[PDB]
Design a protein around this ligand. Sequence first.
Ligand SMILES: [Hg+2]
Ligand SMILES: [Hg+2]
Ligand SMILES: [Hg+2]
Lengths: 130, 130, 130
Amino acid sequence: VERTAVFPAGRHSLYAEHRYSAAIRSGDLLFVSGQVGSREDGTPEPDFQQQVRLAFDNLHATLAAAGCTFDDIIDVTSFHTDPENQFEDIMTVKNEIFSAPPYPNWTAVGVTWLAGFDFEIKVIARIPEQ
Amino acid sequence: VERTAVFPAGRHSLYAEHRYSAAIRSGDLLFVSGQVGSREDGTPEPDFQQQVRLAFDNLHATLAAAGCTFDDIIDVTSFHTDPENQFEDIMTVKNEIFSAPPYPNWTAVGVTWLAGFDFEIKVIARIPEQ
Amino acid sequence: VERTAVFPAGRHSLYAEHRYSAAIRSGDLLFVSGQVGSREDGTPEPDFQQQVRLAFDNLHATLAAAGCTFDDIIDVTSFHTDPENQFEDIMTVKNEIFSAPPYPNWTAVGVTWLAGFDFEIKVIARIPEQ
Ligand SMILES: [Hg+2]
Ligand SMILES: [Hg+2]
Ligand SMILES: [Hg+2]
């Protein structure tokens, strides 16, 4: 009755292949699936920093589909396959995207697997119901 | 003033043993504790695919206690102790439960421990306040 | 338009150093960044049980900044670097803080990294908009 799926514009088949929605808009909240730096075919961008950038691009595209932007993000959780050797690269990209306060909150955790990817960002955004 | 606990019908003592609620209903949202394929005594179902199925059964039972069903799930996060050798089994079960779109969103992550279990699913569901 | 950051009273520079907010108040919900047992300089409390206690103290301080307390927590997720040898210590502290029902829900997961810490707690609290 409210379960409305949101998908990035264009063609991205991982959502079709694995059968899950890119995001779910429910009332005044948008719950986004973890985003990864994947190409149109579902494979990861080889270079790490590039994968992180692409992940953010895919995130933005998914947010756009709901009329959202990074400014509407109210909760952030990131997963890392090897956070130790990846944080400098991640911060470079994060400080480029989140340039000025109020900064988003954040929970970064080290995981053992991300379906072939090395970075993933799970986000929740507010969607005012007007 | 709003912190109302929700428990699956019947007797399941892991919540009593570890002292935590199966789910929390707050306003128009239901935050469910991660569900696992555990028997009444708190031990895991030995066979993997069976554990995943039981986990979903336990999830459904917890949702039912709040008047919810899988259709009310607005966010899904799953943890895996060895995602590589478990995804085919997991998809078999997921495609049986989530048979048709709109599919739920999803974030699957590889973890190192799940208190003896090999699969866990953390969910958030919408509970319209009428 | 709603993205309002919340910070624990006093001086804690990890939020400044890593550029992220301690919590985000959005409508009737407060999304708190994972809390860890860190000193004012950002380093962890050496003793485990002490780190867990400090983590809870830092959590309470962040909640206070929004006018919240542990009673307003509606969702709990904890990460552990070595859950096997840490659960007895964690429960000692949890049973001291969450002494009586309704207990909070809970999702505990084993992770590989937490930026030098061994325990982290990500929480969501309800903030009635009156
Ligand atoms: Hg929005
Ligand atoms: Hg419901
Ligand atoms: Hg509050």
